[PDB]
Amino acid sequence: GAEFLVGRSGSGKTKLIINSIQDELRRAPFGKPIIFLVPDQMTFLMEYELAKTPDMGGMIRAQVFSFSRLAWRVLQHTGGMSRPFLTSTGVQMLLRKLIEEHKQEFKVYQKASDKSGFTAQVERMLTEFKRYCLEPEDIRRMAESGERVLSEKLHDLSILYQQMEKSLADQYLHSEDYLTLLAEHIPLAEDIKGAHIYVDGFYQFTPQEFRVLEQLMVHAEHITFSLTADKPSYEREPHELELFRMTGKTYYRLHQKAKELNLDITYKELSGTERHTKTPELAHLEAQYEARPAIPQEALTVMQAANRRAELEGIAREIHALVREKGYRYKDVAILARQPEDYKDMV
């Protein structure tokens, strides 16, 4: 089966999944596996929240996983983990060696291949190639078919890619080969059967992740996708200028995959401003942040600092006051930065 949990953030889509999993765990301790699929930056959070139930005090039927961790477990049951693993640096070194003996075959990157930053750039590019389901044959197809410059650099990349896959064949495993090996071992994985699989925290998926996702649509009894948007269309892709274009496009993208296999789907729309119920200013934002005829103080403060030093030294005072007078704790406060490198060493 398939399910769709959609709604703007601030509406407890995240808590609803947790309380659901908690309750399914209360009803049956040793039932069919409950799989929680979150980004790697969200695993610990859910592991800490799912265990915060006074009556059970932990999970055993439910497991919080990342794509990599799920791949590691499934491959530890089916096979493939005995194959040696390579780091990005090891791949860079392999690309260095490969460049050294295929430099004279290049059409464009023959002079740039002397630099060490170039092998890192190739590493990133090939990584993206594996992450988006593109084998060397496909890159060759693109090369055979500033189109001139593009065809030539894709030709060079073709050579390096092909020689890499040739060198890693029957011996090694790439860092971006876990999910592909996962998608082709899920069918022959018994523990997958009859297991609930819940997705939350993702804004989008790579095609490599999409393969695993649709495979979970097939061989799993039920699966729920939690996307942060606002009545997204399943007929067309969102406009470029509208707010929820990522989540919206993925919402659209999942529907064709679900309707292709013709699996029955369920709706879910959340209206309530559950997070912002206490304070007025927060709720208005979620609903009409995007709104162009923007309709017009206690909780929302805009601060201007002389510098980053005064900014952090000011934020320190605010946090101090928040835990001193307003009875907050440090675990409540969050500090976000678009470019963390500008504040880290001073933070």
Partner 1 sequence: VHRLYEKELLTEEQKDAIDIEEIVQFFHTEIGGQLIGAKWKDREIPFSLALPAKEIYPDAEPLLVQGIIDCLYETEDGLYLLAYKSDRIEEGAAPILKKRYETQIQLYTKAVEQIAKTKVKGCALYFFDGGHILTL
Partner 2 sequence: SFAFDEKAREQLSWTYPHQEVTQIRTKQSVSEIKRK
Partner 3 sequence: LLNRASISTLHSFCLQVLKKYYYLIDLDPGFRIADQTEGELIGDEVLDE
Q: Pick from 45, 56, 108, 134: which binds partner 3 (CB under 8 A)?
A: 108
- Closer residue to partner 3 (CB): 77 or 115: 115
Torsion sign (Cα): 271, 274, 275, 277: positive
Q: Is 9 annotated as a binding residue?
A: yes
User: Does 44 interact with partner 2 (rule: CB under 8 A)?
Assistant: yes
- What is the rounded CA–CA span in Å between residue 170 and residue 157? 22
Q: What's the min distance (Å) between Cβ of 134 and partner 3?
A: 22
DSSP annotation of 237 reads P
With CB cut-offs between 5 and 8 Å by kind, which of partner 1, partner 3, partner 2, none does residue 267 bind? none
Cβ-in-10-Å burial (0-12, 13-18, 19+) of 278 comes to exposed
User: To which H or E segment does residue 2 belong?
Assistant: strand 2-6
**Residue 34 binding result from partner 2, partner 3, partner 1, none, given CB thresholds of 5 to 8 Å by partner type:** none
Positive/negative CA dihedral, 68, 71, 77, 80: negative
The dihedrals phi and psi of 159, each to the nearest 5 degrees, come to -65, -50
Tell me which of 15, 111, 259, 317 binds partner 3, using CB under 8 A: 111
Closest separation in Å from C-beta 107 to partner 2: 51
CB atoms within 10 A of CB 120: 16
121: contact with partner 3 by CB under 8 A? yes
Q: How far is CA 311 from CA 246, 300, 335, 343, in A?
A: 32, 17, 12, 10
- Is 10 known as a binding-site position? yes
Residue 194, both tokens: 């009859």
Choose one: 17-25, 44-52, 56-64, 218-226; the region binding partner 2 (CB under 8 A). Answer: 44-52
Residue from the set 28, 29, 48, 68 that interacts with partner 2 by CB under 8 A: 48
Strand partners, 5: 226
Member of 63, 208, 224, 273 binding partner 1 (CB under 8 A): 63
Q: Which of the listed partners (partner 2, partner 1, partner 3, none) does 296 bind, with a CB threshold of 5 to 8 Å by partner kind?
A: none
Compare residues 115 and 166 and give the one whose CB is closer to partner 3: 115
Q: Give me Rg for the CA atoms of the chain.
A: 24
Binding-site ranges for partner 2 (CB under 8 A): 44, 47-48, 323-324, 329-330
Where is the binding site for ATP, in residues?
9-10, 13-15, 228, 275
Where is the binding site, in residues?
9-10, 13-15, 228, 275
